[PDB]
Amino acid sequence: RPRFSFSIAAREGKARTGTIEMKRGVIRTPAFMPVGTAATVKALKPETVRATGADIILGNTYHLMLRPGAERIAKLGGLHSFMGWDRPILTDSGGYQVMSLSSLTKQSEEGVTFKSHLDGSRHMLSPERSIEIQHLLGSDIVMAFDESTPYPATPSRAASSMERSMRWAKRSRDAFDSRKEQAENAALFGIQQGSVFENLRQQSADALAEIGFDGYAVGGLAVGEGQDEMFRVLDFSVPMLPDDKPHYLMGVGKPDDIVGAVERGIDMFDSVLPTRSGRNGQAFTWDGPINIRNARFSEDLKPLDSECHCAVCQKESRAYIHHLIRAGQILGAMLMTEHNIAFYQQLMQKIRDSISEGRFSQFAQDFRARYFA
Amino acid sequence: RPRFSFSIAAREGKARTGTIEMKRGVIRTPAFMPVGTAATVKALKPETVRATGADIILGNTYHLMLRPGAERIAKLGGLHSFMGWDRPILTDSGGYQVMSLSSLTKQSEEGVTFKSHLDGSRHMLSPERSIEIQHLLGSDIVMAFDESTPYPATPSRAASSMERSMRWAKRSRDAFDSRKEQAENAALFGIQQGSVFENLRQQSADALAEIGFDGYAVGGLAVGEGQDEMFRVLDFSVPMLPDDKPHYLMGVGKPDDIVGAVERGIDMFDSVLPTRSGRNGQAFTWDGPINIRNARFSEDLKPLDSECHCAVCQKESRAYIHHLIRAGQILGAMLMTEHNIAFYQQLMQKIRDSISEGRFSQFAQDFRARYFA
Ligand SMILES: [Cl-]
Ligand SMILES: [Cl-]
Ligand SMILES: [Cl-]
Ligand SMILES: [Cl-]
Ligand SMILES: [Zn+2]
Ligand SMILES: [Zn+2]
Known part of the structure; x- marks a missing residue:
């Protein structure tokens, strides 16, 4: 199989169905990606997760970097070998869970430092370190490292965080490309930001397309805005992304939210x-x-x-x-x-x-x- | 298959190997019976328990009578149908866990009343009610209801409790036999008591054999006496039981205790x-x-x-x-x-x-x- 090939087999309005072919397997789209590293409640063997029909699972960089640690996982042969799942794995960047779960944080243009919610040990994430950790895990789809925009957000803060996220998207792209093994075997997705503002969403899409990614996530949704607003934002946001690449709605969600998001051009989901x-x-x-x-x-x-x-x-x-x-x-x-x-x-x-x-x-x-x- | 047939295929010293044939399946002996109703930590599907090689599992009357309740289980088709295990089930009498787990107890010649450790609701067990509950569950091997002897025990208290247990064994036998469906389809085991005292163990064995049971448990061990003492008691106690019926060591145990107990004539184990x-x-x-x-x-x-x-x-x-x-x-x-x-x-x-x-x-x-x- 190729490193990455997204093929659209059929369309209906904005909805698409097709396949993503990767070295470790084929992913049928629209896809739901169950979490494979859920805290405390991980309760299924990999064979069982596969039996349900999952083609790909999601791994949480934040949890894995704390326990058992990224370097340890690499020493043990990578995340696939460690947990016993041989099909594709998408890893998040770690950024969101730092903001939601860690006890103290210091944010800057370089990245973020934070204390573990487990033992108050100090850790760091940055575009470069996030890409490195996802490399150590050996994930197949790597997410660019971005800066979260809380809801609601003022126009100024939404713009600032979107702009920083686009600078970080370029840093992520360069870090990924500079690692031969990762560049040749994995894929990299960029994340659109801009909150509820159409002009910022457009600027973000344009910046991401200029850099070039294998797929494009719509970030900053499912953070308390409600379905009507989420759908309104998807209405204008998804068409801004390259049509020929997968569109990933992060953190969604409820069954009706998934159906409505597919109606608006989304190909991939996790929740x-x-x-x-x-x-x-x-x-x-x-x-x-x-x-x-x-x-x-x-x-x-x-x-x-x-x-x-x-x-x-x-x-x-x-x-x-x-x-x-x-x-x-x-x-x-x-x-x-x-x-x-x-x-x-x-x-x-x-x-x-x-x-x-x-x-x-x-x-x-x-x-x-x-x-x- | 027959209701109950124990056949010994081979012997070595006091050790025996064979089969118990029952309507729901064959049990290979010496047998270990995993608990199928363990509080909080039940973590295996019935198919998985079977895949490990288990021929029979143990159900706890005390836990089941509290949640979901014996009458409810009967209404839902019995314990086999309820939990999805179609092979033989042995149920304990409930008596031991009343003494070990319930908050308050009143003991008498008629039985025991107690408060649930869950919500302090009041409940009752007696030879007749225990046999009735095991009937409602639909178990294949039913244990006679006895009175526990704490360790250590004085000669007088060991004798009193053994004597009461033998009166209760006769009551259990009669209750079991008076229920046509139970008598024709299930088996009944009696429990030898007498603590560490050879003369009381002998009196208990004689009383049980006079009544007649399908199998004989050695009760009152694995309650803190230590392996040396447990083995000493088994040395004289097991040969007192009918040779042609299974010998069940309740609550044992560690792997070395199991091996040593088989060396002394034990056919069945739970722990x-x-x-x-x-x-x-x-x-x-x-x-x-x-x-x-x-x-x-x-x-x-x-x-x-x-x-x-x-x-x-x-x-x-x-x-x-x-x-x-x-x-x-x-x-x-x-x-x-x-x-x-x-x-x-x-x-x-x-x-x-x-x-x-x-x-x-x-x-x-x-x-x-x-x-x-
Ligand atoms: Cl760990
Ligand atoms: Cl704000
Ligand atoms: Cl219940
Ligand atoms: Cl005593
Ligand atoms: Zn179902
Ligand atoms: Zn093993």
Whole structure:
């Protein structure tokens, strides 16, 4: 296989379906990428994650740089060998989780220094160090290091952070290219910033296209703005990105947000929602989410979802899973998580099939009517 | 298959190997029965437990009567259907965990009343109610309800509790026999008591044989007496039991205790040790137990054990499992538990094979030399 080849097989309005071919495997798009390094609640073997239909998983640079450490992972043969997943891995840059999880931070044009939320040890990230860490992990899709823009943001702060992010995108590009092994075997995605401002989104897209990336993420969304606003921003933002490269919506999200984002040209998604939901008792179904802890499920012998093809729905009852989750059993979290991740993959498959067949608009309508009935 | 048929295929000294045929399947003896209802740390699907080699699992009446409740389980089709295990299940009587886990207790000749350690709700167990609950669960091997003897015990208290236990054994026998569906489809085991006193052990064995049971447990051991004393008690106690029925050592235990107990005529074992050990970081190996949390394993790419045939040892490194357990990940507990349960099954298989081949004495010697090297 090639290092990277994105091919669009079919289109419907702004929606696209196709494939990304990489050395470690093919990724079907639109794609959902489950998190493979979720704190505390990692509950599935790699074979199980693959069985749900996932083509690629996401690794968190921030968590991995703290435990077990990036240099250690490299010594042990890289992240694929370490965790036992041989297909593509996308790594985030670490920047977002520094801002959201670390205890103290000092930000500058060079990068950020921070204290671990685990033991208060001191660490550093910069465009160069982030790219280096993602190299040590051996990830297949590397994210450029950017500076987060909180929500809401003033026009001035949105502009400043977008501008810094574009300077950092060039630094990321150069760091990636200067490492032969990484440049020849991995891909690099840039991240569009600009908050809710169309002019800043345009400047960011133009800067990123001038530098040139293998894919383009829409950053700065799913940070509390609400679906209406997120959709409004996607409406103008996605068409600014190169049409012939994948479009990645970071941190999204809920099933309806995914459907609407595909309607607006997005090809790739990640979110902790399905994995985190599991242990907390939330199961996704075609008739909307349910909370399995609710007493109404205590004697319900039906599967979590009536149509779901997953191994959990083939074998396990709502009543048993209700009991396991109530009783604080590890197995309850395992079953909920396997189902939720599988549900998301079945959603993506239905999206892909409907675009290929020219009936995605109808699917989106039918999906919403039932999911929110 | 028959309701119950124990057949001894080979012997070596006091050790025996054979099979128990029951309606739901065959159990190879000597057998280890993993707990299927362990509080909080249940971390394996039934298919995985079966894959380790387990022929039968143990269910805890005390836990199940509190959550989800015995009547509820019966309404949902019985414990096999509820939890998804279609092979034999042995249930304990509930009596031991009442004494060890419940907050307040009132004991009498009729039984025991107690408060749940979960919510202080009031509950009751008696020979009749225990047998009824085990019927509602639908277990295949039902344990008679007895009265626990703490360690150490005075001769008078050991005698009193043994005598009450024998009265309760007759009540258990009669309750079991009076329930047609249970009597025709399940088996009933009696429990020998008498603490460390040979004369009381003899009286207990005689009383149990007069009543007649499908199998005989040696109760009152593994309660803090130490291996030397446990072995001394087994030396005289096991030969008092009917030779042609299975001998079950409740709550044992460590690998060397299991080997020594087989040398003394024991056919069946249960212990939470392998399952509890997992999340706490203890892995059993042929070279003795290790604690995977130890820093020495952080870069160790070898499997937990060099010869273990389990799926964990085929795929996973010590370094990864070390990381998962340190990081508090559910998957770490899953992997440790699968390996430990599989290790125990491989131990039992080696014991069975060695008895069949007349080389169990040699196996026991070789096992100990390596395990304690
Ligand atoms: Cl602001
Ligand atoms: Cl419950
Ligand atoms: Cl006493
Ligand atoms: Cl670690
Ligand atoms: Zn499902
Ligand atoms: Zn193993």
